[PDB]
Amino acid sequence: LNRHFTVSVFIVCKDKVLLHLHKKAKKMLPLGGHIEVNELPEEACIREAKEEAGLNVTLYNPIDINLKKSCDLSGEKLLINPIHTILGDVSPNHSHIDFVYYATTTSFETSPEIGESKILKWYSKEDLKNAHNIQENILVMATEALDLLE
Amino acid sequence: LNRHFTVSVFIVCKDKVLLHLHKKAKKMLPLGGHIEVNELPEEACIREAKEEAGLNVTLYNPIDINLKKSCDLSGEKLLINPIHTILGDSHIDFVYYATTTSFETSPEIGESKILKWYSKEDLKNAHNIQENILVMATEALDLLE
């Protein structure tokens, strides 16, 4: 019931996944940020991907057709579910729930919007244990994203 | 800024799933309700199961081993993922499935008084259960029975 909800998106292009340097916190992280009030967590992923990397993405969304159709009838809508749900304590510096999504994009080219982190890098499954500025759980999810989206 | 997020929990005991009646507009619904300020959706589920049915439950939580361990190594926590996320009434509802060990229920005051356990046959024969609720109740049963 409070602004303690954020989203994270691991974007895969062919055989690599994208991360960006948070800044004011020298560490590589997936794109993401707060969810606007009256905004769906999935729409937040889409906008953050556009704002932080100028990318159009395709969220991984395995549809449960039975529930999707029954929901529509009932006047409701089955949304894309997060892959994982994590409790964060920093960046933002207040306790928050982070809904993690995996997605794909067409090109490695990126163009962050004003004031966003300008250091974006693509990583191969090999460039895993090689970095020294990527938290372990981020290394794991980036790898899962790659294993899932090739 | 308040969000009004809600949660839904389908509780399975043996081969039956639990639903309670919303006298107004009829219809049987899973347990759940609004999420308190500073409360995790999963905590809301455990809380509402206790308040609406006087039940201790265990939420379905398939553990991503490598992620759980690494999270503990990063200063974060891997939480229980919702089974589904639905937009309805307009608000976002996080759906979870769970188990309990006993059929006996006891709702607190200010909570729906009519609780009922359903087998798959019972679900098919009911006259007051919406289709989407039928589908999720069946999934809970198929996954947890």
Side-chain angles (χ1 to χ4, degrees):
Chain A
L1 179 73
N2 247 47
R3 15 65 58 172
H4 288 140
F5 295 86
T6 70
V7 300
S8 285
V9 201
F10 284 88
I11 304 173
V12 171
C13 187
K14 51 163 284 293
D15 300 308
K16 306 197 179 188
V17 57
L18 171 69
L19 299 173
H20 76 338
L21 208 185
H22 198 77
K23 97 167 61 181
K24 288 184 177 58
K26 217 179 192 301
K27 68 167 73 167
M28 297 310 284
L29 297 173
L31 308 193
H34 77 310
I35 307 177
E36 199 260 303
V37 74
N38 198 55
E39 173 179 57
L40 305 175
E42 58 192 77
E43 300 180 316
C45 288
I46 292 185
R47 46 170 281 267
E48 291 291 18
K50 197 66 170 181
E51 301 180 316
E52 309 191 325
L55 299 175
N56 278 157
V57 296
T58 289
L59 299 172
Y60 172 64
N61 177 26
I63 303 290
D64 181 345
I65 198 65
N66 277 288
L67 187 56
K68 184 182 170 184
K69 306 189 78 164
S70 55
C71 272
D72 297 319
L73 289 173
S74 310
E76 299 177 302
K77 292 186 178 180
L78 181 68
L79 307 176
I80 157 67
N81 206 226
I83 305 296
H84 295 301
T85 297
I86 299 175
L87 180 62
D89 214 42
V90 60
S91 192
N93 300 309
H94 59 76
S95 195
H96 58 97
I97 288 175
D98 180 65
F99 289 132
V100 184
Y101 295 80
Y102 297 162
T104 59
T105 198
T106 59
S107 63
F108 290 126
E109 207 182 310
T110 53
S111 179
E113 291 178 14
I114 192 177
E116 302 284 10
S117 169
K118 297 304 178 61
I119 305 175
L120 288 64
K121 302 190 61 182
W122 293 91
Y123 299 79
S124 62
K125 179 132 63 285
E126 295 201 301
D127 304 316
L128 205 169
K129 57 171 178 54
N130 285 177
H132 303 303
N133 66 322
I134 309 176
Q135 310 164 187
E136 303 304 312
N137 68 326
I138 296 301
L139 287 177
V140 171
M141 294 189 284
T143 300
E144 299 187 339
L146 281 169
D147 294 335
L148 178 72
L149 308 173
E150 189 182 312
Chain B
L1 300 176
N2 288 58
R3 188 70 188 234
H4 303 66
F5 277 134
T6 69
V7 294
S8 282
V9 58
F10 289 80
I11 306 166
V12 172
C13 181
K14 297 177 192 172
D15 295 313
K16 299 186 181 181
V17 59
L18 180 65
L19 301 181
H20 65 175
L21 175 78
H22 267 329
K23 307 173 185 67
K24 170 270 184 293
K26 321 166 185 177
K27 306 167 190 173
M28 300 306 290
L29 250 57
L31 300 190
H34 302 295
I35 305 180
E36 312 190 341
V37 171
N38 279 309
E39 173 181 53
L40 286 177
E42 52 188 86
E43 284 312 304
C45 287
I46 295 168
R47 192 196 98 235
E48 260 136 30
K50 302 178 71 175
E51 305 185 327
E52 315 180 340
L55 293 171
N56 286 149
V57 307
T58 299
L59 303 324
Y60 171 68
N61 180 29
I63 305 297
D64 183 329
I65 309 301
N66 293 318
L67 185 57
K68 178 178 181 178
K69 297 180 179 175
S70 60
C71 275
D72 299 314
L73 298 177
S74 302
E76 302 193 297
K77 310 296 187 55
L78 179 58
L79 304 167
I80 302 172
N81 204 229
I83 301 293
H84 295 301
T85 296
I86 300 167
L87 176 65
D89 55 293
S90 180
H91 66 75
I92 295 180
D93 184 62
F94 300 113
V95 183
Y96 295 84
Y97 297 161
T99 55
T100 192
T101 63
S102 176
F103 280 126
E104 199 168 297
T105 57
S106 176
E108 294 186 340
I109 288 296
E111 226 64 74
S112 303
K113 273 192 177 180
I114 307 300
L115 290 135
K116 296 185 176 183
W117 289 99
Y118 297 82
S119 62
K120 288 188 289 179
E121 168 191 40
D122 291 345
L123 287 171
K124 185 183 296 301
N125 299 339
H127 304 109
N128 52 1
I129 301 182
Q130 291 165 288
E131 196 59 29
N132 63 313
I133 302 302
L134 284 168
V135 164
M136 291 185 279
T138 59
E139 298 192 314
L141 243 26
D142 290 337
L143 181 79
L144 280 37
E145 78 184 319

